[PDB]
């Protein structure tokens, strides 16, 4: 849904650029330049807030996935030392486990 928000704010900005390259003599003819500059500014603010929200969602996903990726290292390290201290993993195969 954040991806759909990003593409639905991506297309009015590019069609605004494609409009204002086409009707440039009319838009400069009406002297409306600062107002369509302000319409451009509004379109870029909506584009920047939707790409920043997709960014913060992706950064949320990557900190949660790598925090539970760190739990893999903790649990596999403690079962390698708790099994290799008592029983026989022959004290070299734990380097594969940790690596």
């Amino acid at each position: 849904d954040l991806q759909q928000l990003d593409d639905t704010t991506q297309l009015p900005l590019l069609s605004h650029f494609a409009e204002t390259v086409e009707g440039l003599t009319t838009i400069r003819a009406f002297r409306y330049e600062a107002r369509f500059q302000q319409k451009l500014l509004e379109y870029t603010d909506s584009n920047n807030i939707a790409s920043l929200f997709l960014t913060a969602a992706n950064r949320w996903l990557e900190v949660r996935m790598e925090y539970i990726g760190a739990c893999v290292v903790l649990i596999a390290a403690v079962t390698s030392i708790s099994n290799s201290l008592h029983r026989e993993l022959s004290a070299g195969l734990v380097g594969l486990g940790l690596t």
Partner: protein
């Protein structure tokens, strides 16, 4: 494994004795260490229970002013929580040599662990209320903890066990960080004494805590409300 003593149950029940130099006992100095942690834990759970802890049962749910020292307290807190988890480990490996269950090695930093976590929950709920100077419970905690750790550091100096002991380098690192927390709290006293504009902004990641800047806890409400509704412009 025995009755839980706080100290040496062995050596024909020695080291409870105070006899000569009264602050020269290590059991006396960690018994002086454990008193500010229970003072914050027993002043703070009432005011956080009555002021933020489900007093507003589901109906509170927006502008977030930060106090100065804001990155420094949380980064210095994670240094404290790191080195005090090393104190819990270096206590329990020193306890596990002889079967006597000396509880002076791990119980006072267990209370300091609960005190440092509830101190940061006290700071997190004393900002965004912006009652600014109900921090006088917190400055009391850094004064008493810094005072009893300097007594523990010079009493470690008086037995001349220094730089070989991990408990010595541990407690000296705790000595310099407790004064660091005390100087950033007197920096909070320094500006003025005993705002940020927010008009429908909803992207909170510049102005949130340092931990929740780092692991993005503000976004969790947006991913909770995304299952309610497809979100809009």
């Amino acid at each position: 494994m025995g009755p839980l003593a706080f100290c040496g149950s062995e050596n024909h029940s020695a080291a409870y004795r105070v006899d000569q130099g009264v602050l020269n006992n290590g059991c006396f100095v960690d018994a002086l260490n454990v008193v500010p942690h229970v003072f914050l834990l027993f002043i703070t759970f009432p005011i956080l229970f009555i002021g933020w802890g489900s007093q507003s049962s589901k109906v509170h749910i927006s502008t977030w002013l930060h106090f100065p020292g804001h990155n420094l307290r949380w980064i210095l807190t994670f240094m404290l929580l790191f080195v005090l988890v090393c104190e819990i480990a270096e206590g329990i490996l020193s306890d596990g040599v002889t079967e006597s269950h000396h509880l002076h090695l791990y119980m006072p930093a267990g209370m300091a662990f609960m005190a440092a976590v509830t101190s940061v929950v006290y700071y997190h709920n004393i900002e965004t209320s912006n009652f600014p100077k109900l921090l006088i419970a917190l400055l009391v905690y850094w004064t008493l903890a810094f005072i009893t750790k300097t007594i523990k550091f010079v009493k470690f100096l008086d037995h001349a066990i220094g730089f070989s002991q991990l408990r010595f380098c541990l407690t000296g690192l705790l000595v310099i960080l407790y004064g660091m927390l005390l100087l950033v709290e007197v920096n909070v006293i320094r500006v003025r004494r005993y705002d940020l504009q927010d008009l429908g902004v909803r992207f909170l990641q510049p102005f949130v805590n340092l931990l929740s800047k780092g692991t993005y806890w503000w976004m969790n409400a947006f991913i909770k409300t995304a299952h309610k509704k497809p979100i809009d412009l």
